[PDB]
UniProtKB/Swiss-Prot annotation, chain C:
Superkingdom of the organism of origin: Bacteria
Subcellular location: Secreted
Keywords assigned by UniProt, alphabetized: Secreted
Main localization category: secreted
Family under the similarity heading: Belongs to the WXG100 family. ESAT-6 subfamily.
Protein name per UniProt: ESAT-6-like protein EsxR
Gene Ontology terms: cellular component: extracellular region
Species for this entry: Mycobacterium tuberculosis (strain CDC 1551 / Oshkosh)
Annotated coiled-coil segments of the chain: none
UniProtKB/Swiss-Prot annotation, chain D:
Taxonomic superkingdom: Bacteria
Domain writeup: In the heterotetrameric form, EsxS adopts a long helical conformation that pairs with a second EsxS monomer in an antiparallel manner that allows the N- and C-termini of two EsxS subunits to interact with an EsxR subunit at each end of the EsxS dimer thus creating a molecule with four-helix bundles at its extremities.
Residues of the full protein shown: 17 to 76 of 97
Naturally occurring in which organism (per UniProt): Mycobacterium tuberculosis (strain ATCC 25618 / H37Rv)
Localization: Secreted
Main subcellular localisation: secreted
Descriptive protein name: ESAT-6-like protein EsxS
Family of this protein: Belongs to the WXG100 family. CFP-10 subfamily.
GO cellular component: extracellular region; protein-containing complex
Coiled-coil annotated residue ranges, if any: none
Subunit structure: Forms a tight complex with EsxR. Exists in heterodimeric and heterotetrameric forms.
Key words, A-Z: Secreted
Length: 55, 67, 56, 60
């Protein structure tokens, strides 16, 4: 059941980043919050497209 | 930390590829299933329709002017 | 809504054949009752096959 | 009239068949188009996920 797995993995990555990331680098084009917003939006889009493809 | 991130990043990339292949296979299967189901039902419909037309032919012939 | 139309037309024809039962030639092959029985099975088969074709 | 009802049934059978055939053809095409769109959206999203994973890695 890939939808739930993609969501859980995505959440695990976001939460790891939140605990690890003691000094976000500005040259990567975003802030932690900017990254988090984009990550959650990308995952949503990814999972919704998968669910449409498969059923 | 870093090997933990690596593990998760790698699994996410792998899982995205697997999900894609699975979904492509699922769609192909669903299109085939829908077509097979329709073809079968259509064949049953055609057989039943031919029976109905046959029975109507018989009834019209039998009844003649009484139809 | 063809399933309902097929079913109701089929019932109309069954009724009319029964109303005209006295006019039915009984020496041409299929009997009056035979026809009624076969008609009702064909109609059920037809309606069900149509629903199968249309069915999500 | 029996003959009129018989004519109507024969007509209606042919119409029902045409409607069902047409609907199946439509639904197969709609499914195929929806899958292609979804698949395109999935690929675009995956590209973003890969870009964002690299950003995360750079910031560790």
């Amino acid at each position: 059941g890939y939808a739930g797995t993609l969501q859980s993995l995505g959440a695990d990555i976001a939460s790891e980043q939140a605990v690890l990331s003691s000094a976000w680098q500005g040259d990567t084009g975003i802030t932690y919050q900017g990254w988090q917003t984009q990550w959650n939006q990308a995952l949503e889009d990814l999972v919704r497209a998968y669910q449409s493809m498969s059923g | 930390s870093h090997t933990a991130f690596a593990a998760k990043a790698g699994l996410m990339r792998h899982t995205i590829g697997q999900a894609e292949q699975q979904a492509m296979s699922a769609q192909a299967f669903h299109q085939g299933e829908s077509a097979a189901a329709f073809q079968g039902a259509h064949a049953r419909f055609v057989a039943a329709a031919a029976k109905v037309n046959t029975l109507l032919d018989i009834a019209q012939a039998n009844l003649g002017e009484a139809a």
